[PDB]
Amino acid sequence: HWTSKVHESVIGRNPEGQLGFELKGGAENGQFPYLGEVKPGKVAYESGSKLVSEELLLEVNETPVAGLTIRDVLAVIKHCKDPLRLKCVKQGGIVDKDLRHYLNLRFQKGSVDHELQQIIRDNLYLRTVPCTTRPHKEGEVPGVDYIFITVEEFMELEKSGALLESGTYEDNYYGTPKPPAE
Amino acid sequence: ARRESYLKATQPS
């Protein structure tokens, strides 16, 4: 399963209040939060397993953070007292930092992988406004319910890799652009 | 949350 190798690694802050690794990725790059280079001298381990480089960050103190921007992940961590309980999973095989692709995967309904995928999708949806080519309907605030764009624009976001989800419903395009880094 | 039109377009049924 996708969540087979998920493990928890409990760490503390170092001097300068850092983690001994940098957070990369985030929804703004269309990615899972993931660990930069984990160097031995700098991670203040407490308990659980060890962190390696490139691991996908899933949860901080039971708060799911996959699907969020780096900025939001940093914000969860800052409102968490030590020690930080990190649920992570190594990249490799079908486990990858690419959020677009992860959201295309199709797991069994009822599966832990499916449950998790839905949590990650909702996180993504909390930080983004979808875009569509269908006309503004009454009741809708442009830029909140939907960024209303032309097909040429949708096609251009598409080709540029700006979209994490996309598709047509009734002769019109619908997608989710990457949130901005803030 | 996202509307049915968006999900019918972006998610496999």
Swiss-Prot record, chain A:
Family (UniProt): Belongs to the MAGUK family.
Function: Seems to act as a scaffold molecule at synaptic junctions by assembling neurotransmitter receptors and cell adhesion proteins. Plays a role in nerve growth factor (NGF)-induced recruitment of RAPGEF2 to late endosomes and neurite outgrowth. May play a role in regulating activin-mediated signaling in neuronal cells. Enhances the ability of PTEN to suppress AKT1 activation. Plays a role in receptor-mediated clathrin-dependent endocytosis which is required for ciliogenesis.
Compartments, as annotated in UniProt: Cytoplasm; Late endosome; Synapse, Synaptosome; Cell membrane
Source organism: Mus musculus (Mouse)
Subunit structure, as described in the record: Interacts (via its WW domains) with DRPLA. Interacts (via its second PDZ domain) with PTEN (via unphosphorylated C-terminus); this interaction diminishes the degradation rate of PTEN. Interacts (via guanylate kinase domain) with DLGAP1. Interacts (via the PDZ domains) with GRIN2A, GRID2 and NLGN1. Interacts with CTNND2, CTNNB1 and MAGUIN-1. Interacts with ACVR2A, SMAD2 and SMAD3. Part of a complex consisting of MAGI2/ARIP1, ACVR2A, ACVR1B and SMAD3. May interact with HTR2A. Interacts with RAPGEF2. Identified in a complex with ACTN4, CASK, IQGAP1, NPHS1, SPTAN1 and SPTBN1. Interacts with DDN.
Domain annotation PDZ: ranges: 8-92
Annotated protein name in UniProt: Membrane-associated guanylate kinase, WW and PDZ domain-containing protein 2
Tissue specificity: Expressed throughout the retina except in the nuclear layers and the photoreceptor outer segments (at protein level). Highest retinal expression is observed in the outer plexiform layer, the outer limiting membrane and the inner segment of photoreceptor cells (at protein level). Expressed in brain.
